[PDB]
Amino acid sequence: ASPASIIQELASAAKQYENNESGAREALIAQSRALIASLEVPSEFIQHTFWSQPALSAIVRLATDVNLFQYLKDAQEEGLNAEALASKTGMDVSLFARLARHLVAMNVITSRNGVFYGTALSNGLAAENYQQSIRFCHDVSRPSFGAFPSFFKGNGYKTPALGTTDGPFQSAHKVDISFPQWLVGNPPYLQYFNSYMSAYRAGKPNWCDNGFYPVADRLLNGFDASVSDVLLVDVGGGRGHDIATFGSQFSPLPGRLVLQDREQVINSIPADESRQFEATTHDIFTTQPVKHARAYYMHSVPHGFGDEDAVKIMANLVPALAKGYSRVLLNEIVVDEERPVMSATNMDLIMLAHMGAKERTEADWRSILTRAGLKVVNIYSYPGVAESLIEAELA
Amino acid sequence: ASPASIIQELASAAKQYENNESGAREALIAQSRALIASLEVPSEFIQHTFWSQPALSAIVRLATDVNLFQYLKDAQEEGLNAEALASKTGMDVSLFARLARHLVAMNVITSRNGVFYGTALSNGLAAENYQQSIRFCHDVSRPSFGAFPSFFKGNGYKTPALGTTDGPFQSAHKVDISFPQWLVGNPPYLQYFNSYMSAYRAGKPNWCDNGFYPVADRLLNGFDASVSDVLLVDVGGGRGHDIATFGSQFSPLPGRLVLQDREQVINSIPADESRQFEATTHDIFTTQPVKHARAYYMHSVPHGFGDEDAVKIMANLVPALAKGYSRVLLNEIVVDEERPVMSATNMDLIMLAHMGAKERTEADWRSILTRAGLKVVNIYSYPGVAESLIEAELA
Ligand SMILES: CC(C)=CCC/C(C)=C/CC/C(C)=C/Cc1c(O)c(C)c2c(c1O)C(=O)OC2
Ligand SMILES: CC(C)=CCC/C(C)=C/CC/C(C)=C/Cc1c(O)c(C)c2c(c1O)C(=O)OC2
Ligand SMILES: Nc1ncnc2c1ncn2[C@@H]1O[C@H](CSCC[C@H](N)C(=O)O)[C@@H](O)[C@H]1O
Ligand SMILES: Nc1ncnc2c1ncn2[C@@H]1O[C@H](CSCC[C@H](N)C(=O)O)[C@@H](O)[C@H]1O
């Protein structure tokens, strides 16, 4: 694809974005990235990859220490010059200006006549769940990626055997314990991860949104309280962000919403009397205790585990499924390995960097499900979103 | 700015690029990066900044250990599938494909029907000087940026006072010596750096190219061998790539070209009977030994030093200058703090993370030059080129 060819494909993607077609925003972004690569000389690729981006990561991390994005949000259309922001942040003015000027250059904040102004991005990054995501990513994930070359040279360029305890995460952070055990042993990073989970794919269509999975036809239609008064269980749902969205979309609810996660996660949920779900403790490596519910939902859970654990996780739902009633809803990335895209590779490498795990093709998922005693009904996807929704049933 | 307005500017700069207008390639990349910023939601920014790019850096680093880009260059348009490259690189084929698919998604290589192919980018990165740049950047510069949050938290968010010994480089690499001393004390990174200086801005218009600095009218016109038989001294020219480029564009040369650097750099230059310059050792903090030359040229040298040192560097040329004849040519970034651009913020932060130094405005440079006993004749710039060309003369 020549630059002239990409310029045309970008202009055609822009028209579809203007027509508000699904995924056209994401397609317009990917055409813009392909155009950059077709134009940059190798020296510019070196400067962007190893100068601009590591410095951006460092400054954005430093932003969470000094309240930078919160000050620019509160300053609104007025903004703040370098002297003002240096005074609020407690920073040397020349230091601040130099760092903020990289943010301007990287399109994270804007400047005009010496004044700095928030963006929708920087205003969005001021929220506490993004603050804690930035901290987790820079303090925890970044060193694991930095250790890929030495670790894989040291292990013979082998895929980590057990995944849980012989990967780049353990070498970077100088431990011989698994990443979940590391989380529990290294506060505040368990809590940052719990906040992070409400942010890693936010602002994208949800599995249950309109045009994606037909929730109303498959779940609400035919829901039967004589079989079970539970409508949906979110197995591994974290603090509940996902099940909370579902409840808001499909109210009045005909049955209960049950959140399941580990006790340390469940205890972290802020008390709210408007809550529509019941926050419960359940370990996915034991048999599912809620019986015959209309739907059992997982999002970004078995993708962190090897084949045997992924088969157990799914098989532990089987004893609770009511034949001809209970849906198994697996909300996970399905790798199309003939068409690689960044949404899948990002998560696959994040899975390698933390859990020594991997993302899966439709064939791999079909195999884990069949071994678990389940079979696929249908797979649903939506343009622009990373994950698919695999509906499964008792084999 | 609005996406629909960036869409038009991108299309406008596309027309300018297809007319081969100066800097239009660089403006199209900039408009492409601006559109992506206007479209990406914060969660996508998080995944790109904190997953895609650190993963990209490490895979490009790992590529230099297993001869990847070279194998893809050898394969030319035939390419290699995952099993073949895994065999050649000595990696598990599953691990290789996962890492190679991120290079595909990030536009570093391409894929069709399970075959991977090199690009102009990956083919260019196979060259040794880029291989060593990659090694330097991921091993040496990467941890320096990674220590920015903790270092400036600890030092009070202050500019490094001395710069050389009190910076994030010393904090990241657990030393209290200067970066130049660290280089000498940590082979092979000195020589990696020396190769790196032929790559960090390669493929961009040089100061002496057509439409930039008028070398012929200012230097060749009026060259007077009765004053001196030396046409140009490159003060701090590394292994001589810049002075070699100059000699080839302006042959047959009317006078001598003299390179000056540290002996540990000069004695790393491959012996070459076709070379057009004389390779000499000279310390920029001693008086310039070559007397009355037509030009004394500096590229990316005093930007690495504080004000007092940079004055000495420029001042040490003054005793050698022939009044009304000798030109001083300083080829450095001139920061426009009314217009932040990646080309200057990149190298400014690079200067901070290695030398504790900074890039300078036109006011800063004029003040240093005046203190050195010099005055500015003119300042030359070129669309899309990071550096300017400041011509100075005896005050
Ligand atoms: C409370 C306790 C007993 C132990 C800790 C339990 C725990 C949090 C375990 C981790 C389980 C797991 C599948 C993690 C796998 C996982 C993701 O899925 C997602 C989306 C992300 C990351 C990740 O590691 C990540 O770094 O960025 C997003
Ligand atoms: C051999 C010896 C005795 C001493 C070592 C002398 C030495 C190499 C000192 C370094 C001097 C100096 C101004 C360095 C400043 C400098 C750059 O300019 C450029 C373009 C780059 C970097 C950099 O640090 C960098 O990291 O990426 C490109
Ligand atoms: N053994 C276990 N039992 C129950 N939950 C577990 C578990 N191991 C990991 N988890 C949970 O699985 C989740 C994976 S991250 C996914 C969170 C949420 N489903 C979302 O997509 O936003 C985490 O919340 C983690 O606490
Ligand atoms: N004290 C000193 N005396 C002479 N050269 C020095 C020096 N300190 C640093 N240098 C040289 O200054 C150069 C800075 S990097 C710039 C290299 C080259 N001018 C280019 O633009 O590509 C290095 O080659 C380094 O060896």
Task: Give a written overview of the molecule.
Chain A has 395 residues and is an alpha/beta fold. Chain A has three domains: 3-125, Winged helix-like DNA-binding domain superfamily/Winged helix DNA-binding domain (Arc Repressor Mutant, subunit A), CATH 1.10.10.10; 128-197, no CATH class; 215-394, Rossmann fold (3-Layer(aba) Sandwich). The first copy, chain A, has helices at residues 3-18, 24-37, 42-66, 68-75, 82-89, 93-105, 120-125, 128-146, 148-154, 168-172, 179-185, 189-197, 215-220, 241-249, 263-266, 307-315, 342-354, 362-372; strands spanning 80-81, 110-112, 115-117, 230-235, 256-261, 278-281, 295-299, 327-332, 334-335, 360-361, 374-380, 388-394. A seven-stranded mixed sheet of chain A has the order 6-5-4-7-8-12-11, with helices on both faces. Chain A has a three-stranded antiparallel sheet with strand order 1-3-2. In chain A, strands 9-10 form a two-stranded parallel ribbon. In chain A, α1 runs antiparallel to α2 and α3 packs across α6 (93-105). Chain A starts with a helix and ends with a strand. Chains A and B meet through α1, α2, α3, α6 and α7 of A and α1, α2, α3, α6 and α7 of B. The structure holds 4-farnesyl-3,5-dihydroxy-6-methylphthalide (2 copies) and S-adenosyl-L-homocysteine (2 copies). One S-adenosyl-L-homocysteine is lined by residues 197, 236-238, 242, 261-262, 265, 283-285, 299-301 of chain B. One S-adenosyl-L-homocysteine is lined by residues 180, 197, 236-238, 241-242, 261-262, 265, 283-285, 299-301 of chain A.
